[PDB]
Design a protein around this ligand. Structure first.
Ligand code: U3Z
Length: 92
């Protein structure tokens, strides 16, 4: 959408705690495409109900490993470059 397709399709190696998160929702490898990392992050967010009906575009990740990894208590799913940057902080 806001992120170039080529950037989305690149192979990445998560750092250990990001890998822990992905493994907790069924991921079974050491390397992923960015798009794959984003999918499993999505499944994690939905599993842990890190959302709210009053603000439907906001991930509420405070007091959660995702919050610790991203360094924020919440963020908007519309901020695609900001999300990519938060993910790059968690890649080898
Ligand atoms: C940059 C970027 C980017 C932003 C959003 C998405 C897709 N998703 C969304 O639109 C989205 C929206 C919400 C709420 C209910 C809060 O609106 C929760 C989670 C997601 C998310 O996953 C959707 C999925 C898997 O595809 C579980 C079904 C998501 C995934 C990872 C992240 Cl880091 C954030 C959101 C993908 C990439």
């Amino acid at each position: 959408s806001q992120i170039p397709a080529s950037e989305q399709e690149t192979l990445v190696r998560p750092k250990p705690l990001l890998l822990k998160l992905l493994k907790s929702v069924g991921a079974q490898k050491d390397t992923y495409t960015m798009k794959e990392v984003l999918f499993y992050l999505g499944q994690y967010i939905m599993t842990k109900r890190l959302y709210d009906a009053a603000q439907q575009h906001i991930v509420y990740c405070s007091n959660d490993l995702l919050g610790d990894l991203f360094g924020v208590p919440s963020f908007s799913v519309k901020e695609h470059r900001k999300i990519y940057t938060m993910i790059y902080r968690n890649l080898v």
